[PDB]
Amino acid sequence: IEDLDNIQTPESVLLSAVSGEDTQDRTDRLLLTPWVKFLWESYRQCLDLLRNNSRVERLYHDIAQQAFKFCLQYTRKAEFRKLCDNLRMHLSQIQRHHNQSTAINLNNPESQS
């Protein structure tokens, strides 16, 4: 529909072309970005609140891996936040050692694997 529509540059498309870029990003933001900004916020909340440490979840690390592969399909600036998320949650583990949680030592699953 976007490159079905007449590209033959009118004034309204020419005026915005000192700041802006292509029509596909301009209208994909209207119908795709509210869904990928939901996928991000779905993943981050599933990690952060629910599975802080809690030893009994290999799913936590499954989600982390899946959400890293999600960044290869869509936006990248929601991947620096993902790194910082893993950094602070790892920092949160070996600072307290204070709940029925992950013992990151000889334990092959919850240290190596």
Next chain:
RNA sequence: GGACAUACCCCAAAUAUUGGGUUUUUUUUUUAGAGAAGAAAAUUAGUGGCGAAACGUACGGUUUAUGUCAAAGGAGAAGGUGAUUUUAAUUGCA
């Protein structure tokens, strides 16, 4: 010298503009996104009093006959007499 810790600082970042990183000094409390805002307590009457009989009557419990049914015994057990002969007393029967 004034402002700054939810940093008024630091980094990161274009289709991105919101994520992280740090200073001490006091006390303070064991964690943090939850707990109070809904399923419960209670209530009773305008509930007449007293009260039989006729008729009717069950499963059972035990006593007494009764039929049939299981072991033990034909030494036993034990009932019946004018089949007999003499005789005073005791115990007696063959």
